Amino acid sequence: MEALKIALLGGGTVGSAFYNLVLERAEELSAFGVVPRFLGVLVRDPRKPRAIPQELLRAEPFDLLEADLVVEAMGGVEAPLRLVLPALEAGIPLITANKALLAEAWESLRPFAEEGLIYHEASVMAGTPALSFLETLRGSELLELHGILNGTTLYILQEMEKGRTYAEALLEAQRLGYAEADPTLDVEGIDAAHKLTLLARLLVDPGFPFAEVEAQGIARLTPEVLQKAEARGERVRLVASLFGEGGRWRAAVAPRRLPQDHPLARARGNALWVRARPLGEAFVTGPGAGGGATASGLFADLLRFLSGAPGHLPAPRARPPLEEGSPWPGVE
Amino acid sequence: MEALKIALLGGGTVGSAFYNLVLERAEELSAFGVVPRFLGVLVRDPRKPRAIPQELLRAEPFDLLEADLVVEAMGGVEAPLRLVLPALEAGIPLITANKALLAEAWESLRPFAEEGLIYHEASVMAGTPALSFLETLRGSELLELHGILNGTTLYILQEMEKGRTYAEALLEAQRLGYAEADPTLDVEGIDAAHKLTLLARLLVDPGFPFAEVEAQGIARLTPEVLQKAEARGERVRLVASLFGEGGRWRAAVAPRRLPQDHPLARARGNALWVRARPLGEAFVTGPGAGGGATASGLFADLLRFLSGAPGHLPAPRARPPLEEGSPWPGV
Amino acid sequence: MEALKIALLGGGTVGSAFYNLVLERAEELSAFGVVPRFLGVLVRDPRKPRAIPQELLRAEPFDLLEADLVVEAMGGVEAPLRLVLPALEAGIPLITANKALLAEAWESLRPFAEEGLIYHEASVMAGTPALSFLETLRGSELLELHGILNGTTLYILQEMEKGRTYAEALLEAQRLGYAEADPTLDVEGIDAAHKLTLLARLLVDPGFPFAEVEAQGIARLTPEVLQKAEARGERVRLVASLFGEGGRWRAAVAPRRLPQDHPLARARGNALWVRARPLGEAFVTGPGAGGGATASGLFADLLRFLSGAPGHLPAPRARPPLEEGSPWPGVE
Amino acid sequence: MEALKIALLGGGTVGSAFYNLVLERAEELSAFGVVPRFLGVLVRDPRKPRAIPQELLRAEPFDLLEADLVVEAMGGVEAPLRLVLPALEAGIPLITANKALLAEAWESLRPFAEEGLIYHEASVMAGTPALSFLETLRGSELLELHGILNGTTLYILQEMEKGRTYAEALLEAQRLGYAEADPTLDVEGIDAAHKLTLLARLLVDPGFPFAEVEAQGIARLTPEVLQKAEARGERVRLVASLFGEGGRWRAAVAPRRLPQDHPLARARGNALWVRARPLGEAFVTGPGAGGGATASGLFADLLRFLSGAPGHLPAPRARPPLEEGSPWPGV
Numbered sequence A, C: 001m002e003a004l005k006i007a008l009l010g011g012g013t014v015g016s017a018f019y020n021l022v023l024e025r026a027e028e029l030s031a032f033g034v035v036p037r038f039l040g041v042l043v044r045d046p047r048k049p050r051a052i053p054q055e056l057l058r059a060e061p062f063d064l065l066e067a068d069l070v071v072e073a074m075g076g077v078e079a080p081l082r083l084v085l086p087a088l089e090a091g092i093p094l095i096t097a098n099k100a101l102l103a104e105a106w107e108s109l110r111p112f113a114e115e116g117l118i119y120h121e122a123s124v125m126a127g128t129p130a131l132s133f134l135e136t137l138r139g140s141e142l143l144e145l146h147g148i149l150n151g152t153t154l155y156i157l158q159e160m161e162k163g164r165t166y167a168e169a170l171l172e173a174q175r176l177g178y179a180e181a182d183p184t185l186d187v188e189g190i191d192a193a194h195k196l197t198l199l200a201r202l203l204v205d206p207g208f209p210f211a212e213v214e215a216q217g218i219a220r221l222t223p224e225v226l227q228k229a230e231a232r233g234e235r236v237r238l239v240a241s242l243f244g245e246g247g248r249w250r251a252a253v254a255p256r257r258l259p260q261d262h263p264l265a266r267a268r269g270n271a272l273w274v275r276a277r278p279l280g281e282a283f284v285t286g287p288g289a290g291g292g293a294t295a296s297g298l299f300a301d302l303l304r305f306l307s308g309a310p311g312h313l314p315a316p317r318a319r320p321p322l323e324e325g326s327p328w329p330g331v332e
Numbered sequence B, D: 001m002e003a004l005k006i007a008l009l010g011g012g013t014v015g016s017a018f019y020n021l022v023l024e025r026a027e028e029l030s031a032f033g034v035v036p037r038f039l040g041v042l043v044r045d046p047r048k049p050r051a052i053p054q055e056l057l058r059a060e061p062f063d064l065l066e067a068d069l070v071v072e073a074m075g076g077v078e079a080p081l082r083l084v085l086p087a088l089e090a091g092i093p094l095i096t097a098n099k100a101l102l103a104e105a106w107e108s109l110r111p112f113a114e115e116g117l118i119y120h121e122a123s124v125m126a127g128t129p130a131l132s133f134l135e136t137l138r139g140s141e142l143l144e145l146h147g148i149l150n151g152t153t154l155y156i157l158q159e160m161e162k163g164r165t166y167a168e169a170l171l172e173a174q175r176l177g178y179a180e181a182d183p184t185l186d187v188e189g190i191d192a193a194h195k196l197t198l199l200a201r202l203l204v205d206p207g208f209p210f211a212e213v214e215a216q217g218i219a220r221l222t223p224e225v226l227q228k229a230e231a232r233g234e235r236v237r238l239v240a241s242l243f244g245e246g247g248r249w250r251a252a253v254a255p256r257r258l259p260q261d262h263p264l265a266r267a268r269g270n271a272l273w274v275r276a277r278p279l280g281e282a283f284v285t286g287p288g289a290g291g292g293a294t295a296s297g298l299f300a301d302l303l304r305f306l307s308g309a310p311g312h313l314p315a316p317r318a319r320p321p322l323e324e325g326s327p328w329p330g331v
């Protein structure tokens, strides 16, 4: 039996769900010969009422170098980056839920991802299998990928379809714990774009630049636009697409008019739809935001590490698209 | 005596300070023949402890069309936009502290600003008189503008000069109520860029796009860099700059090495510095964040409205810069 | 028009209700030629979510000497005492809700009460008129006084009468904001005893010692004891009594078996029942705890001060009881 | 493997630390053939953020009679009493951190303590082994006992030595989770008196009344008094004392001038010092408050129970003091 020493960065929606999940599953962990021991939980304000014991809360400096794992759910880019890098350089793995971090700080983080030190299933579709799904898709060559990757905006669209207003659905999504602290990241497509970037790097090109993703959000959509789509036999969704144009991979996020019986239009939660050679058409759906959903992904990654598997390695090589593709039609 | 009926969107740092200021100052409004009456206060969580009566909290959106004024300080862009547009469409003014809303949703909001329906003193440097300062500066032709517009970042750099860490200073800024919900908006320069856009629109180009502001933040600054600057008789500040380059207005936010005796370097609080023709060089400074500071700006706008004055108008046309300029050196 | 500068000590149940009430009634205040201006609100922890704006919160040192009024609702004895005394010595009035303070620190505070500097209607039966009621009773001589002065214990008894348990009624009383932070003060009769002391000092003896009050609480009472009383045509209540025995005033707190149609048994809230010469029998009832109830008393006292009336002066002289008395029967 | 079914009363500083300790350490219980299973956790406000699953929170009292153990850390006296007595009546042990409950409700609880059904290590000096220390001290006849039992007051006086104010030190004690909900219980000596009563009951008189403890607190101490004491080679501490006077056991809590090199003056943490016959002079010290510290004591008691050992028994008879004693000088 031995201790698994965890340093947790962040004690919010995701971090507090993860802390409690780890201790709630300590019986599972003992079956792996480990007992979990948090070293501390990095937070901003120790006095906020919080679902972690106050005594475990930390302010910087919070030394990470005795940890067996750093788990990060702080949000942002530069603040987590400067904390994780000393632990990665010491060969301590990072399990993260932070797409922005990975999308925007890849020059610093790619070399550690290439060594198997970064686990980030929870950074795309929370604990819904998205990264593990694509890793198994490597058996084939991608033809086209289309996903609904932002939980907050999916929620809002679904609620507007039912005749509810944008502003009340946003408020709900925020209370549900789905939204980024800057909700424009959600609604402008940027969080989806971060996630798309990560999917491109795992599968098609380990250097795919976040700057190349074209993104636009849901700010022109209303219950009326969505109700008219429904009348045309369509559903409008924000869709993140990776597809071939000109022998290069293109990545875009935008509202799309989907056929209403398409898998993406009928998804139960966030969804990833792919066509690949020779596999064919495959699909995965589930919750894509929320504290418990996300904690599940982080804990899956923790079990993955205890198994002796490396983290999520980028694509070993960049390859052009086999097939010219396109997205669905945009919204006028 | 008649009611002045107010719908308040947001009951947080700024909205609660405002609510409580209006109540404390309510007797002042009797000079205009009114008593303030709040129709409702939009909030997310009506169970949080709050200095606003439970009976007035609305955890869902409510009808605004009986209001005399809508006051907004809820943060974000598309949600406040969609909530205020029907009021604006009905000729009900908006008083707002939300720079992001105005910077990012200007295609929608510009026409109402042009009609005098939008008051936003509190959206730049809180209740420090920045927008009224610039309104009087329109007597002259702008040569160049440089401000220190972000409260949080200024506070951080000043504390880091005094030996505190970046982290400790940020935390104290947050406890003081200065920061955006996502403090990267502060420290990456985005909030300063939103405010810079509004300044450009008021002065030189009423269609100035937020997207044309270049912004960087303070991520590369260490207490070393700040102390080397001091060794050079400089101070490093995040500065928002509006200046002519090639016959066109540029807008940029970045860390700048300032001479230590420049008004911007020395100012007590956030600061806005101009040169203009024929006035010369003028400067205003004061608190640029904080609930009470912001509530003062919102209430100043409410008194402006009660006086019969319109809101803050965009520049009546675009025009090119009279002179070529530049910012200070970067870091 | 002029400012009324208030220093508030305490921002809890009572203090936060008072702050908000003052600003909510600022239109009333202007009719008195004043505008209210808080100088600060003394609290322990500035980060607790709290129904006062964070910027107005203070930690010691909090200078009070520019105030026109100090309002205190901190609780305890020594902590408020050391803060109020410099303001009283400078001739600044105190409006307080703190019975314990006055009961236990009367050697220090009596001389200021005798000068008209202490207003404390909210210290007995919250904003229910109890002190003002007794002041008007001075037209007569007291024969006997009996009150139900503790809100928490009244609530618990009422709930147990309905078959609910002690522990769930306590929990409710606490959520309702009724209880002292040490709930044994309530349930052991001590808070009632503090209040009884104050009533004795206003009416019969300005030096009446808190140590002379005999107190016992409700800890032997159960739904069964109360249900049996009801069957006997009785109600059991904790009662605070001032009555003559031997030519001296005696003060006691204890459970009593009351006739079920007695005013004290049928009270709507906390209650004060007196017989006096030549007035006769008089009674006052209302809410005796709760933040808004209490804020009402503190604000009544603030209006009283703005009127030019002094605070609650102790009895000008000690007089023996005219009449030998007794309480109701105790509970076996 | 079988469930060890636990009903937890209280989910605060101590109850949540306990809950989370049991879960972290759960694998240890497999040595006894059990896995811990909580039947419910009694709390007042089930909406507060809490490190205990929402599904297990009970905002009202729930049936305890299927439990194997009741664990109590809810505070107060009559409410926990009424909640635990039916479990005790059914032969279900109680593990408690609540000194007040035991000190004040002993007429009710004594008979169950005598049957080995009450474990309360955590009620005195948290998980520092005070009660097991005294259990081994029963090999000897008590001469005198002196402790520093209140964590909050010790912390305050130590910080005031270092120049912090009384107020600032109290506030930090509260943020550290040390203080009672009413901190006057700490600083007036009442909490120390409750604990002193329990010590007397364990050692010398199983019926020792809480009401016979004399208690005063630290209200008269200033940083002056503490610095004059140091000038005299003394330290001032709140001390709980059990000693013979006139053939009877006295119990007192008060500020005492200690020689600065006495174990009590120097101790790292809260401390319990005895002299006994024929052992001599022995001493134990360690953390006396705090969630984790307390959870360690509760969990130590849970392991004690799983081992087959009874709870903490009162002294099997009263007896008079062997020797006359006294405390240190007062202040």
Ligand SMILES: NC(=O)c1ccc[n+]([C@@H]2O[C@H](COP(=O)([O-])OP(=O)(O)OC[C@H]3O[C@@H](n4cnc5c(N)ncnc54)[C@H](OP(=O)(O)O)[C@@H]3O)[C@@H](O)[C@H]2O)c1
Residues within 6 Å of the ligand: A009, A010, A011, A012, A013, A014, A015, A042, A043, A044, A045, A046, A048, A072, A073, A074, A075, A076, A079, A080, A097, A098, A099, A100, A122, A123, A126, A177, A178, A179, A180, A181, A288, A289, A290, A291, A294
């Ligand atoms: N919510 C979801 O559904 C979800 C799902 C998947 C991925 N994510 C990603 O997971 C990450 C966390 O999201 P969230 O919803 O948990 O955020 P959150 O609720 O805002 O939590 C962030 C936490 O990190 C702390 N923190 C943030 N910046 C810090 C700094 N510079 N120094 C010290 N402490 C810091 C915060 O302190 P305080 O509590 O004291 O402020 C808080 O405990 C983000 O990267 C987000 O994009 C979220």
Ligand SMILES: NC(=O)c1ccc[n+]([C@@H]2O[C@H](COP(=O)([O-])OP(=O)(O)OC[C@H]3O[C@@H](n4cnc5c(N)ncnc54)[C@H](OP(=O)(O)O)[C@@H]3O)[C@@H](O)[C@H]2O)c1
Residues within 6 Å of the ligand: A167, A170, A171, A174, B009, B010, B011, B012, B013, B014, B015, B042, B043, B044, B045, B046, B048, B072, B073, B074, B075, B076, B079, B097, B098, B099, B100, B122, B123, B126, B177, B178, B179, B180, B181, B288, B289, B290, B291, B294
């Ligand atoms: N802080 C400053 O110094 C300052 C100064 C000038 C301008 N500003 C701007 O003023 C605005 C407010 O800032 P602040 O500091 O007051 O933020 P804050 O404390 O976070 O308050 C935001 C308020 O709006 C509510 N809210 C947020 N999103 C909502 C939604 N979707 N639906 C309904 N209610 C919602 C929140 O509800 P809950 O309370 O229920 O969460 C809260 O009452 C922002 O636009 C900020 O940029 C701030």
Ligand SMILES: NC(=O)c1ccc[n+]([C@@H]2O[C@H](COP(=O)([O-])OP(=O)(O)OC[C@H]3O[C@@H](n4cnc5c(N)ncnc54)[C@H](OP(=O)(O)O)[C@@H]3O)[C@@H](O)[C@H]2O)c1
Residues within 6 Å of the ligand: C009, C010, C011, C012, C013, C014, C015, C042, C043, C044, C045, C046, C048, C072, C073, C074, C075, C076, C079, C080, C097, C098, C099, C100, C122, C123, C126, C177, C178, C179, C180, C181, C288, C289, C290, C291, C294
């Ligand atoms: N509740 C009622 O129904 C009621 C009715 C009438 C009279 N009373 C009396 O009114 C007084 C207040 O009662 P309450 O229910 O308001 O108490 P509460 O909710 O516990 O509030 C006490 C307040 O004073 C603060 N405080 C306490 N001691 C302090 C210290 N030493 N230094 C600085 N701040 C201090 C607290 O800070 P934090 O919030 O940061 O801890 C809190 O803001 C008591 O004397 C009580 O007997 C109560």
Ligand SMILES: NC(=O)c1ccc[n+]([C@@H]2O[C@H](COP(=O)([O-])OP(=O)(O)OC[C@H]3O[C@@H](n4cnc5c(N)ncnc54)[C@H](OP(=O)(O)O)[C@@H]3O)[C@@H](O)[C@H]2O)c1
Residues within 6 Å of the ligand: C167, C170, C171, C174, D009, D010, D011, D012, D013, D014, D015, D042, D043, D044, D045, D046, D048, D072, D073, D074, D075, D076, D079, D097, D098, D099, D100, D122, D123, D126, D177, D178, D179, D180, D181, D288, D289, D290, D291, D294
């Ligand atoms: N703090 C220490 O260092 C320490 C050490 C040893 C012993 N103790 C003793 O341990 C006990 C608990 O202390 P603590 O610091 O954990 O207090 P705490 O943080 O205030 O927690 C008390 C808990 O009990 C709940 N509660 C209180 N009264 C209740 C009622 N009438 N009905 C239902 N639930 C109720 C509270 O509910 P909410 O959370 O919903 O309010 C909270 O979960 C006390 O007896 C204290 O003397 C404390």
Ligand SMILES: N[C@@H](CCO)C(=O)O
Residues within 6 Å of the ligand: A123, A124, A125, A126, A149, A150, A151, A152, A153, A178, A179, A180, A186, A191, A288, A289, A290
């Ligand atoms: N804000 C993100 C959280 C989950 O990654 C979303 O709505 O998808």
Ligand SMILES: N[C@@H](CCO)C(=O)O
Residues within 6 Å of the ligand: B123, B124, B125, B126, B149, B150, B151, B152, B153, B178, B179, B180, B186, B191, B288, B289, B290
């Ligand atoms: N976050 C903003 C608040 C004031 O607009 C700032 O620091 O300047």
Ligand SMILES: N[C@@H](CCO)C(=O)O
Residues within 6 Å of the ligand: C123, C124, C125, C126, C149, C150, C151, C152, C153, C178, C179, C180, C186, C191, C288, C289, C290
């Ligand atoms: N705890 C007190 C509050 C009101 O004085 C009671 O229950 O009466």
Ligand SMILES: N[C@@H](CCO)C(=O)O
Residues within 6 Å of the ligand: D123, D124, D125, D126, D149, D150, D151, D152, D153, D178, D179, D180, D186, D191, D288, D289, D290
């Ligand atoms: N309030 C108690 C907690 C520990 O029993 C103390 O300070 O000692």
Ligand code: NA
Residues within 6 Å of the ligand: A121, A122, A123, A124, A125, A126, A127, A128, A129, A130, A131, A297
């Ligand atoms: Na995932």
Ligand code: NA
Residues within 6 Å of the ligand: B121, B122, B123, B124, B125, B126, B127, B128, B129, B130, B131, B297
């Ligand atoms: Na301004």
Ligand code: NA
Residues within 6 Å of the ligand: C121, C122, C123, C124, C125, C126, C127, C128, C129, C130, C131, C297
């Ligand atoms: Na009263």
Ligand code: NA
Residues within 6 Å of the ligand: D121, D122, D123, D124, D125, D126, D127, D128, D129, D130, D131, D297
């Ligand atoms: Na112990």
